[PDB]
Amino acid sequence: HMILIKLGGSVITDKSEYHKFNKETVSRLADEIRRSGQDVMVVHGAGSFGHVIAKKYAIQDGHVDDGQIPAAARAMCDTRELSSMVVEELLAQGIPAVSVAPGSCFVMEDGKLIVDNEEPIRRLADLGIMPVMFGDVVPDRKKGFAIVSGDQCMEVLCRMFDPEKVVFVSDIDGLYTADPKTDKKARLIGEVTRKKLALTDITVADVTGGVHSKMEAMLRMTDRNRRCYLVNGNAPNRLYSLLKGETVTCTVA
Amino acid sequence: VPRGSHMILIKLGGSVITDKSEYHKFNKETVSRLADEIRRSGQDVMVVHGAGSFGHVIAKKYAIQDGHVDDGQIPAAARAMCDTRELSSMVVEELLAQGIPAVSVAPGSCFVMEDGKLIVDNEEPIRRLADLGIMPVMFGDVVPDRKKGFAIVSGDQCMEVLCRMFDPEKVVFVSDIDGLYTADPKTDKKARLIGEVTRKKLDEALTDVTGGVHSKMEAMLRMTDRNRRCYLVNGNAPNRLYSLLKGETVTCTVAK
Ligand SMILES: Nc1ncnc2c1ncn2[C@@H]1O[C@H](COP(=O)(O)OP(=O)(O)O)[C@@H](O)[C@H]1O
Ligand SMILES: Nc1ncnc2c1ncn2[C@@H]1O[C@H](COP(=O)(O)OP(=O)(O)O)[C@@H](O)[C@H]1O
Numbered sequence: 360h361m362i363l364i365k366l367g368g369s370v371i372t373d374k375s376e377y378h379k380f381n382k383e384t385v386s387r388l389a390d391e392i393r394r395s396g397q398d399v400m401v402v403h404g405a406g407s408f409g410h411v412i413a414k415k416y417a418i419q420d421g422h423v424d425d426g427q428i429p430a431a432a433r434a435m436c437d438t439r440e441l442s443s444m445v446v447e448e449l450l451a452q453g454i455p456a457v458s459v460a461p462g463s464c465f466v467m468e469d470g471k472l473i474v475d476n477e478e479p480i481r482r483l484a485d486l487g488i489m490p491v492m493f494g495d496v497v498p499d500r501k502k503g504f505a506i507v508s509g510d511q512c513m514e515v516l517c518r519m520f521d522p523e524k525v526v527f528v529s530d531i532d533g534l535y536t537a538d539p540k541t542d543k544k545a546r547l548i549g550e551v552t553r554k555k556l557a558l559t560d561i562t563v564a565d566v567t568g569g570v571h572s573k574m575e576a577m578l579r580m581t582d583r584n585r586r587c588y589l590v591n592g593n594a595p596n597r598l599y600s601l602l603k604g605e606t607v608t609c610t611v612a
Numbered sequence: 613v614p615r616g617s618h619m620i621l622i623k624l625g626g627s628v629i630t631d632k633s634e635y636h637k638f639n640k641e642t643v644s645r646l647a648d649e650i651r652r653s654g655q656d657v658m659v660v661h662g663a664g665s666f667g668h669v670i671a672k673k674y675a676i677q678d679g680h681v682d683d684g685q686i687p688a689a690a691r692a693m694c695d696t697r698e699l700s701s702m703v704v705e706e707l708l709a710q711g712i713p714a715v716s717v718a719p720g721s722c723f724v725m726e727d728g729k730l731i732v733d734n735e736e737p738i739r740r741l742a743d744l745g746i747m748p749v750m751f752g753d754v755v756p757d758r759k760k761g762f763a764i765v766s767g768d769q770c771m772e773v774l775c776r777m778f779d780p781e782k783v784v785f786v787s788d789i790d791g792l793y794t795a796d797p798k799t800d801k802k803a804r805l806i807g808e809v810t811r812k813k814l815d816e817a818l819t820d821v822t823g824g825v826h827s828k829m830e831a832m833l834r835m836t837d838r839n840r841r842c843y844l845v846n847g848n849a850p851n852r853l854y855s856l857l858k859g860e861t862v863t864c865t866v867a868k
């Protein structure tokens with residue numbers, strides 16, 4: 360709880376290949392989380408277990424035709440199956456946890472996740488059975504259904520539990536001046552609103568906004584005594600060193 | 613007080629979807645056949661299922677149903693909840709393959725328990741999923757408890773909750789027996805099928821967590837009112853669930 364972590368879709372899945380899990384990475388990241396000894400609450404993304412189908416059927420644009428209902432069900436099962444594999448690696452590393460699918464628990468209205476009943480999540484956290492949220496299709500009070508991002512799930516948990524630290528884990532050392540497809544890429548030290556408004560593009564299946572949307576969430580979640588970090592989960596032991604407080608190459612808001 | 617539903621509430625019992633003998637063993641053939649039988653019937657349905665063999669084994673070993681009494685139960689509960697969520701995904705996959713959109717709704721992730729009752733304080737998400745055509749599939753689970761830390765809700769209780777919420781026309785429990793017998797038909801060769809269950813006949817019949825046939829019959833008798841009938845059918849008899857869903861007369865126990 361004290362340190363709120365998002366395991367991004369870019370590290371836990373092969374974002375260019377539908378339904379392709381990165382088990383070795385998730386296992387290591389879970390091991391680094393336990394080794395750090397920190398009090399932690401983990402969210403994860405859908406990656407290629409949700410974005411490929413959601414983009415093909417424009418699920419985030421709302422319920423427009425009936426061909427979307429089977430695709431949404433398929434995508435929901437795919438992402439719940441990804442969550443089980445994440446939870447499996449957590450349990451194996453000594454971190455009791457359980458998937459909490461927002462599309463089975465909550466609703467959406469105007470791009471916001473509506474969490475009317477916080478008791479199950481708070482009781483699970485109190486018991487020590489870490490509630491693990493993740494991006495999902497969610498019923499929408501206007502568009503029939505919508506998509507909530509794990510990024511916003513981080514925001515809900517942040518205002519719910521007030522963490523001391525917020526850590527996003529993705530396949531990049533941090534936010535750059537431009538995507539590391541141009542070799543003029545320059546790592547950005549500290550995120551401010553102006554330093555991003557920076558070239559942020561999307562070259563893989565995406566539905567929830569990419570690095571730019573994660574940056575806004577990071578900027579929104581900063582407070583008087585709360586830093587928000589983006590760290591490269593593909594760098595061995597870098598997440599462990601961050602939770603321990605050691606110096607790591609990363610971006611902070 | 614009218615009814616506004618054609619939905620048939622169905623429980624795929626853990627005795628049928630898994631091997632209660634072995635552990636963590638999914639009966640793909642049987643569940644696939646039952647999913648096909650549900651699809652062929654053309655009825656509007658809502659499926660609950662049991663927690664299966666491995667969930668019941670861990671829960672009994674760690675006395676999960678008796679509440680949170682020491683810290684060793686915490687990793688055991690999380691392990692058991694992951695197994696039953698994996699089982700639910702496998703049940704849901706068979707529904708999707710038949711063209712029946714569905715999604716798992718884990719009670720321990722969405723609800724709480726108190727005094728042995730599953731508490732659904734917010735019904736909006738479940739109802740919206742059903743109105744969208746994505747069938748919400750509940751199941752027996754470890755659930756946070758307001759007095760004991762955690763407890764166990766069975767799929768049978770999940771059926772009573774959804775029966776109160778959605779007011780089905782018909783309720784069908786799918787298990788590994790023709791119905792309620794005078795005694796356990798597996799250990800009494802003289803056991804006779806009770807085709808129609810009443811409070812009298814259930815009490816005088818000779819009947820693992822959350823109870824067995826007796827608890828099932830009690831929920832069945834409670835759900836028979838306002839012209840709704842409740843059935844127990846043998847899911848291991850091919851085409852029997854299908855014929856029951858089509859309205860045909862089959863070997864079963866009915867409560868009227
Ligand atoms: N300016 C930028 N700085 C860093 N990465 C960028 C930038 N623009 C695009 N990207 C790309 O965005 C990807 C990560 O996007 P994001 O969706 O936030 O990851 P996740 O799947 O973890 O949510 C990176 O792999 C990177 O290639
Ligand atoms: N009087 C009885 N009539 C029928 N079955 C009985 C009776 N007494 C015990 N049983 C046993 O109860 C079992 C049903 O267990 P149950 O918990 O209802 O399964 P599930 O809920 O997984 O479908 C049957 O396999 C049968 O062996």
Ligand SMILES: C/C(=C\COP(=O)(O)O)c1ccccc1
Nearest residue numbers: 404405409434438494495508509
């Ligand atoms: C793409 C997605 C969620 C996005 O969340 P994310 O941005 O955290 O990856 C999803 C789509 C269909 C079913 C389940 C999930």
Ligand SMILES: C/C(=C\COP(=O)(O)O)c1ccccc1
Nearest residue numbers: 662663671692752753754766767
């Ligand atoms: C026994 C059980 C559920 C009972 O439900 P059932 O009676 O329908 O089989 C359970 C045990 C551990 C984890 C999750 C569930």
